Write a protein that binds this ligand. Structure first.
Ligand SMILES: [Mg+2]
Ligand SMILES: [Mg+2]
Ligand SMILES: [Mg+2]
Ligand SMILES: [Mg+2]
Ligand SMILES: [Mg+2]
Ligand SMILES: [Mg+2]
Ligand SMILES: [Mg+2]
Ligand SMILES: [Mg+2]
Ligand SMILES: [Mg+2]
Ligand SMILES: [Mg+2]
Ligand SMILES: [Mg+2]
Ligand SMILES: [Mg+2]
Ligand SMILES: [Mg+2]
Ligand SMILES: [Mg+2]
Ligand SMILES: [Mg+2]
Ligand SMILES: [Mg+2]
Ligand SMILES: [Mg+2]
Ligand SMILES: [Mg+2]
Ligand SMILES: [Mg+2]
Ligand SMILES: [Mg+2]
Ligand SMILES: [Mg+2]
Ligand SMILES: [Mg+2]
Ligand SMILES: [Mg+2]
Ligand SMILES: [Mg+2]
Ligand SMILES: [Mg+2]
Lengths: 123, 114, 363, 120
RNA sequence: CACAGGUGGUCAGGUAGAGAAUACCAAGGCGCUUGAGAGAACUCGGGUGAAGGAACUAGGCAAAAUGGUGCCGUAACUUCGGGAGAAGGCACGCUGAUAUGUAGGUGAGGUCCCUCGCGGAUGGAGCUGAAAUCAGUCGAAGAUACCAGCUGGCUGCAACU
RNA sequence: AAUUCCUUGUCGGGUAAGUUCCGACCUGCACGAAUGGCGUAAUGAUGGCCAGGCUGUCUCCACCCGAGACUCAGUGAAAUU
RNA sequence: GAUGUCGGCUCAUCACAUCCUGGGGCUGAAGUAGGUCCCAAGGGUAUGGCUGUUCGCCAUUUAAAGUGGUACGCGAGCUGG
RNA sequence: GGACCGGAGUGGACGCAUCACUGGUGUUCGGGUUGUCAUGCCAAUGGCACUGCCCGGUAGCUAAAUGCGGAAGAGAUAAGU
């Protein structure tokens, strides 16, 4: 349940530490992004020497939320903290080369095979 | 109600082990990767149990790869293949939500030998 | 002092043969002082073709490549972390070095027996890492116990160490491999002194058959693992490496051209170890000698001066830096100099890969 | 909405309601019949009758619960030494509401609530 | 107006507390001169709130928050006082031991003197009594309630009160 | 600029985005030296701006507790017309 | 002998000179994407930074961010910049 | 670079319902706890301190929860053919 102004920890090694959601993409008046949803972000905190820079505007895919995901059986998977993986604006592809922390099955689709393959643990 | 009792009972899993909040449990869940079912183990502390017959649930909390992860399992869902208690913890409280604030040393709980 | 990648695994993984093919191709101690080669310390020549190129261009009387040491760590038993002697020998063996190469078998052989009966590298890696993580959790518990008393004394450094350790402890209690954690450079610095076995950069040497360099479900499993923790791989054959180290240049080229290999796989292995430890190579070029030396990426000019002589480090004045490609294009030190492609670098400089310089000191 | 909810607010905050019904339960126990308002009597059923049920078994713990609920040791004594035995075989329904009309001062609907065996 | 306002002085119990604060009580005094129900919207006065966290708005208005003591620590700048409680960090309950109640306060007998008194020494019985350390112990939480600073940066104006 | 019309001046900072803010510039419509100029620590229920924390301020409201509103009994208005 | 103002909020409602979606003619319409005109009002038709602003610039969305009337709709509904 | 036509999925916004799930609430349930008063005292309890402060939480209500919807068709047409 990521919305505009929601700060996300970053789950890759792109060099961003804290990003902010500035748009929930994919719909007029769309309110929230869950996991597997692309958002537009501004990088609010970056490591000094990283592939991305503070104040950069780009995309991210939400991979962990505190709401979490429901599963078809009715079960839910909540995470501590909201995290996203940075993506290129045009290619939609991840910018880092490492994924840190678990991701979910909801992220498993043609578009995010890289994040699934790189993740330590897919839930 | 009696009708719904029957429908829910006809469906309730029969092998659910005894476990209490604070117990470290390992839950085997079925993962359907494409076509094939494997078992994925989720091992963590039971921080909450909902006792509702067929709608019984329990929350398991563990730190995966640096981040706390809670899975609320539906006890009788057939996706939960098995539950096994690995460590009986000693908490005197039904819901261990205070563990969400605990880190490391203060998040572990006394082993229950009772 | 050098750079080390200890060769580890379960029993019967193909490590002794790997270290043997290493030492057969390596250089004995009669060609490099300061290096008393132990039977578990095998120093081998580092492959830098830029060294051959510079030695062609300048034609020195002698040639010295940089040489890097392997430490073959053998002997592991289930329950190696419960205090037993051979497991503790394993621990003390691996702890001294800094880079770690795990050996995986990714081949099916009726005349070689596996570790659990079914040939599956996932099982191999999980058992080895559960061992290393039990040892590591032991270490981290001791450290966190040693620290929290100090951090309750209000010390800031102790609190930062405490935060890192308590964010690392649930990783180790779950048999997880602590390099998968997103630990910052400051945190890496904070806990470098605990010398954890589970963050040391680890490569994956994949002993595979001759006909299976591609399309290998065991190699595929190793690939997915090495991605899942950001590790690298060198799929090789121990038999092919023994053939490589046991022949002359003519027969080595013959066996390479028959099997389609262009350089020995040991070159690729030691190059994986080279890039594993943030290493890079510079050269000294001259008529007397051309020698390769190796520095960490990020290294200073003063430490590069020191890596030969201490006085060079301490009395440094200026270094005259020319790249390997700049040596290449203009045919020698004089040729690249006459273009002005020396650069004057002081005590704030960082030496890169390929640069050749002539140090100036006054002590 | 108040779908399925129980318990009359009776235009009091909760602790006033609890105090009032404690007092009213004590009044009913010691006098065995009291005039109050019909809604108040209907709610008083839900407090008194469990006290009598509790008093059907005379342990120290049960006298302690009764005392917590009544805060009157004379009421607890009469509950366990008289009322419990007087209702030992009666399966609930220890009170009787008898509507008795309308209070003059505010036209309030009034009832008598008594112990069922108040005749004997 | 039998009006939620205003009106000087005197008294000043207990437990906790620094306290005339505050909480709960005493003596004392009251339940405020319409009640009874119900448990819609809406309003007013509160409580809680998933995920988010100023996106609200003219404006963080309101709310939420901070909040005690001790110790450590404390920047720019300064008129050298300040700034400053800057900021920030740690500890905190209970029980036992030290010590059948300590440091300290009080000080009765008894002993000696005495310009025999409401004296001075000595002496410590009794009473009172922190603070600290160590060890143990309960809880999710020990300044547990009430009470009780939000903090920092840039800047206009006016020295200030 | 408590002063600047043009004007959201220009450039820079800060923000993803800054008519406000801060710094500089100076093309001062229309500053200027006791109807003082310029600085200035401290101070302020003073004006403006930024950040941390904090949050139902908001997304986007939900529930609950009480006082009314509602029903009954008693009493008994008002503006307006 | 009083018809309360701008903007915001809340709630709208109509028109159609249509922003999107629907149908079509022409095209300097290969396709994709457009331009233009005709039909068409069923439904839909941003969030933010700045500023009291509407507006506008800007950031980032959207199929689209339509244009007007309604006392420049709406203060016995709110606000009061 | 790249389609019409036709087909399948899956979303956004919106709407209706519902509470099985996931949750909020839950001053009517249980517990913990500080101060204090009281129940003769101990023990145990109760009152008050915002429900004293909190931790959970049943039913209900409920959204963020999860079901369903917009249609297809058929007449008569618009522009047009
Ligand atoms: Mg009433
Ligand atoms: Mg009166
Ligand atoms: Mg008065
Ligand atoms: Mg007072
Ligand atoms: Mg909330
Ligand atoms: Mg929350
Ligand atoms: Mg705003
Ligand atoms: Mg706004
Ligand atoms: Mg305020
Ligand atoms: Mg100004
Ligand atoms: Mg003044
Ligand atoms: Mg200025
Ligand atoms: Mg702002
Ligand atoms: Mg600007
Ligand atoms: Mg003037
Ligand atoms: Mg003059
Ligand atoms: Mg003058
Ligand atoms: Mg003043
Ligand atoms: Mg009325
Ligand atoms: Mg009436
Ligand atoms: Mg038209
Ligand atoms: Mg108007
Ligand atoms: Mg208005
Ligand atoms: Mg009006
Ligand atoms: Mg005004």
């Amino acid at each position: 349940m990521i919305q505009e102004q929601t700060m996300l920890n970053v789950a890759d090694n792109s060099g961003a530490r804290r990003v902010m959601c500035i748009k929930v993409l994919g719909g007029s008046h769309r309110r929230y992004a869950g996991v597997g949803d692309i958002i537009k972000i501004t990088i609010k905190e970056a490591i000094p020497r990283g592939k991305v820079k503070k104040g950069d505007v780009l995309k991210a895919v939400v991979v962990r939320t505190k709401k979490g995901v429901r599963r078809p059986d009715g079960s839910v998977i909540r995470f501590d903290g909201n995290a996203c993986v940075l993506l290129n604006n045009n290619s939609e592809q991840p910018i880092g080369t490492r994924i840190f922390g678990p991701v979910t099955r909801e992220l498993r689709s043609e578009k995010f095979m890289k994040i699934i393959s790189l993740a330590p643990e897919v839930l | 109600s009696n009708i719904i009792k029957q429908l829910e009972q006809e469906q309730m899993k029969q092998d659910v082990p005894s476990f209490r909040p604070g117990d470290t449990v390992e839950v085997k869940v079925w993962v359907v990767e494409g076509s094939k079912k494997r078992l994925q183990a989720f091992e963590g502390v039971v921080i909450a149990i909902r006792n509702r017959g067929l709608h019984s649930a329990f929350t398991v909390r563990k730190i995966s790869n640096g981040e706390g992860v809670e899975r609320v399992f539906q006890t009788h869902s057939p996706v939960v293949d098995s539950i096994s208690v690995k460590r009986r913890g000693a908490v005197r409280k039904a819901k261990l939500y205070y563990l969400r604030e605990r880190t490391g040393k203060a998040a572990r709980i006394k082993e229950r030998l009772n | 002092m050098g750079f080390k990648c200890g060769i580890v695994g379960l029993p019967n993984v193909g490590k002794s043969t790997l270290f043997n093919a290493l030492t057969k191709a390596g250089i004995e101690a009669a060609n490099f002082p300061f290096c008393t080669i132990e039977p578990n310390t095998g120093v081998v020549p580092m492959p830098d073709p830029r060294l051959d190129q510079l030695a062609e261009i300048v034609k020195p009387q002698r040639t010295l490549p940089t040489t890097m040491e392997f430490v073959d760590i053998a002997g592991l038993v289930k329950g190696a972390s419960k205090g037993e002697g051979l497991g503790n020998q394993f621990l003390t063996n691996i702890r001294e070095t800094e880079a770690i190469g795990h050996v995986v078998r990714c081949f099916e052989n009726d005349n070689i027996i596996a570790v659990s009966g079914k040939v599956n590298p996932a099982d191999d890696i999980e058992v080895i890492n559960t061992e290393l993580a039990l040892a590591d959790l032991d270490t981290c518990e001791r450290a966190i116990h040693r620290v929290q008393k100090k951090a309750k004394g209000g010390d800031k450094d102790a609190k930062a160490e405490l935060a890192v350790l308590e964010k690392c402890l649930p990783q180790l209690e779950n048999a997880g491999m602590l390099r998968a954690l997103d630990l910052s450079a400051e945190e890496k610095a904070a806990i470098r002194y605990l010398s954890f076995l589970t963050l040391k950069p680890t490569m994956y040497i994949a002993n595979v058959n001759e006909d299976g360099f591609e399309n290998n479900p065991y190699l595929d499993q190793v690939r997915e693992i090495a991605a899942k923790e950001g590790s690298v791989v060198v799929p090789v054959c121990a038999a092919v490496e023994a053939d490589i180290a046991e022949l002359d240049d003519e027969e080595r080229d013959e066996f390479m051209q028959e099997l389609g290999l262009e350089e020995p796989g040991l070159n690729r292995v030691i190059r994986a170890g080279y890039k594993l430890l943030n290493l890079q190579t510079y050269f000294t070029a001259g008529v007397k000698e051309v020698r390769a030396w190796t520095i960490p990426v990020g290294a200073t000019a003063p430490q590069a001066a020191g890596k030969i002589h201490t006085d060079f480090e301490k009395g440094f004045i200026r270094a005259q830096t020319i790249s390997f490609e700049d040596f290449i294009t203009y045919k020698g030190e004089q040729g690249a100099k006459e273009a002005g492609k020396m650069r004057a670098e002081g005590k704030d400089y960082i030496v890169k890969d390929g640069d050749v310089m002539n140090f100036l000191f006054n002590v | 909405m108040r779908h399925r909810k129980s318990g009359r607010q009776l235009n009091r905050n909760s602790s006033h309601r609890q105090a009032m019904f404690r007092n009213m339960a004590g009044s009913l126990v010691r006098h065995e019949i009291i005039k109050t308002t019909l809604p108040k009597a209907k709610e008083l059923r839900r407090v008194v009758e469990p006290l009598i049920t509790l008093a059907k078994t005379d342990s120290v713990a049960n006298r302690r619960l009764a005392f917590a609920r009544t805060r009157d040791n004379e009421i607890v004594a009469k509950l366990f030494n008289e009322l419990g035995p007087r209702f030992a075989s009666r399966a609930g329904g220890y009170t009787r509401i008898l509507k008795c009309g309308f209070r003059a001062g505010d036209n309030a609907p009034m009832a008598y609530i008594e112990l069922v065996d108040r005749s004997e």
